[PDB]
């Protein structure tokens, strides 16, 4: 079935210290498995999933060292962006990178992801073709022009088509391919029925009648309700023989 890897990296500069805080969180199929924090014991990549600790020491020596490179990279860009947007010192600014690969059916690549945001707004993103960029503000037109003369998208496509999908395989092969499917209750209280779908995995669920966002239940599974005796509530989830009904 569908598989995905993602790395959410964030760098926050604040008026207090000189180096910004850099955090990286990896996700395989929307479960967190590796983290890096620059505000730590000794900043390093640590496994965040039990199936991930059997990796070997050479693996964390590269990732930690590559993480230290990313953080410097983010430190330099943030300073670069103050000039691009004519921001004087005295504030806090966030730089974010989202990157990863959606696999599929045949353990093949579907769509690559490489995109950045500044002050939580879209700043520049690698397109579906993995060869051209999209830049919203004029301040990012600068970056697009120099990343074009840089051949930057070439490096990133090599990653997304290269180590991204190769290393997604080996993590997957190592709890993940399982399916918890929802318990379904309805709250019979008025002033207005309310359908509950509890304890399911993964989070892709759908409820309708004859609204709140799917959220984690604190233990690795999810939860959702829909708000509204001639009415029925239908549940639709991956692990379901047929969509379930309840009035």
């Amino acid at each position: 079935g569908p598989h995905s890897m993602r790395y959410f990296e964030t760098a926050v500069s604040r008026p207090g210290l000189e180096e910004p805080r850099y955090i990286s969180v990896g996700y395989v199929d929307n479960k967190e498995f590796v983290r890096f924090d620059s505000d730590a014991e000794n900043p390093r990549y640590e496994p965040r999933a039990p199936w991930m600790e059997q990796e070997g020491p050479e693996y964390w020596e590269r990732e930690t060292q590559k993480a230290k490179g990313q953080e410097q990279w983010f430190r330099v860009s943030l300073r670069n962006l103050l000039g691009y947007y004519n921001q004087s010192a005295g504030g806090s600014h966030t730089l974010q990178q989202m990157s990863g690969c959606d696999l599929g059916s045949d353990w093949r690549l579907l769509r690559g992801y490489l995109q950045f945001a500044y002050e939580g707004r879209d700043y520049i993103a690698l397109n579906e073709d993995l060869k051209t960029w999209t830049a919203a503000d004029m301040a990012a037109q600068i970056t697009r022009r120099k990343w074009e003369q840089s051949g930057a998208a070439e490096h990133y496509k090599a990653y997304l088509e290269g180590e991204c999908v190769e290393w997604l395989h080996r993590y997957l092969k190592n709890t993940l391919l399982r399916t918890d499917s929802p318990k379904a209750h309805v709250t019979h209280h008025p002033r207005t029925l309310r359908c509950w779908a509890l304890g399911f995995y993964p989070a892709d669920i759908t409820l309708t009648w004859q609204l709140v966002e799917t959220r984690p239940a604190g233990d690795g599974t999810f939860q959702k309700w829909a708000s509204v005796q001639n009415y029925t509530c239908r549940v639709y989830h991956e692990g379901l023989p047929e969509p379930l009904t309840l009035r």
């Binding site: 790395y7 670069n80 520049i124 991204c164």
Partner: peptide, 9 residues
């Protein structure tokens, strides 16, 4: 495995 960034912004 994380990605290594080329040219900065």
């Amino acid at each position: 495995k994380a990605v290594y960034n080329x040219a900065t912004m």
